[PDB]
């Protein structure tokens, strides 16, 4: 879909922060 | 000339083969072999596409083909270099060298880029558009840092290292999410309040980046080059030479292929292209055979 660049960035970093959180503990 | 980014990138790539004293990636020798094979398949496809679209004069498809070939050549060279290193260090006389947990120069570039972008979006003389573009820069390098931390943790067996690298990464991602958020609010309504809030939001990100910097600086996390014996050097030469020749002929193929794209009716250029393609094939085959013959553990 045609999504906002900021929306995509925020999504990426929330996702990544979750992944990192989980990776150790 | 300076225009030909593909040719210049092949030259840059060749540097990987000049002295493999450190591991460039995280691949096993099995991984390198698999990579070579896959990139062979991909490269063949690309080279076919290059000829076809040069004949037919399909400039956009041709460009995509050159881009594909370039990717495959990068992948080939990384695999070959890594394989070379593994062959070297595996010699009894050779002492192994530590892989760097992070690229310090690339790290410093991320730091400085993020910094400049924060400073930009902090300014009064900064348009709505400029704040967005600044944010894409912040985002680019921030994600680069987090990804590098992810790799660093995977590489290191150190308990405090693994934890702190992943922790620092989380801080960077968190505070960047906070920054991009307030910038989105600012994009919703461009006002002084929102701009000052954005200037605040950069502080915890810059602190987080600075912390990670201090941690990564630690000489325990830096790379140490391998003591590679003359025997090890001799063992890896065929792989290196094959890879280099492959790159020479591939560059030749691209260079000739552009000329053919602009002027298809030229039998000599077609013959030169064919020769380059064949030398590429022969180099890849000699590389694969060389990697088999010199495969470590024997």
Residue numbers in the entry:
A (entry chain B): 1177 to 1201
B (entry chain A): 1361 to 1658
The authors write:
Talin (herein referring collectively to talin 1 and 2) couples the actomyosin cytoskeleton to integrins and transmits tension to the extracellular matrix. The N-terminal FERM domain of talin binds integrins, phosphatidylinositol 4,5-bisphosphate (PIP2), Arp2/3 and F-actin (at actin-binding site 1; ABS1), whereas the long C-terminal rod domain consisting of 13 α-helical bundles (R1–R13) contains two additional actin binding sites and 11 vinculin-binding sites that are exposed upon force-mediated unfolding of the talin rod domains. Caskin2 is a relatively unexplored scaffold protein composed of six ankyrin repeats (ANK), an atypical Src homology 3 (SH3) domain and tandem sterile α-motifs (SAM) domains, followed by an extended disordered proline-rich region (PRR) and a conserved C-terminal domain (CTD). Here, we demonstrate that the scaffold protein Caskin2 interacts directly with the R8 domain of talin through its C-terminal LD motif.
Several proteins interact with talin via leucine-aspartic acid motifs (LD motifs) – short helical motifs that facilitate protein–protein interactions with the helical bundles of the talin rod domains – with the talin R7R8 domains being the best of the characterized talin LD-binding domains. Both Caskin1 and Caskin2 contain an LD motif in their conserved C-terminus, suggesting they might be binding partners of talin-R7R8. Using microscale thermophoresis (MST) we measured the affinity of the Caskin2-LD peptide to talin R7R8 as ∼2.7 µM. To further understand the mode of this interaction, we crystallized the complex and determined the crystallographic structure at 2.7 Å (1 Å=0.1 nm) resolution. The electron density map showed clear binding of the Caskin2-LD peptide to the R8 motif. The Caskin2-LD peptide was found to adopt a helical conformation that packs against two adjacent helices (α2 and α3) on the surface of the talin-R8 four-helix bundle, essentially forming a five-helix bundle. Analysis of the interaction interface showed that the buried interface area is 790 Å. The interaction is formed solely by van der Waals contacts between the talin-R8 and caskin2-LD helices, as hydrogen bonds are absent.
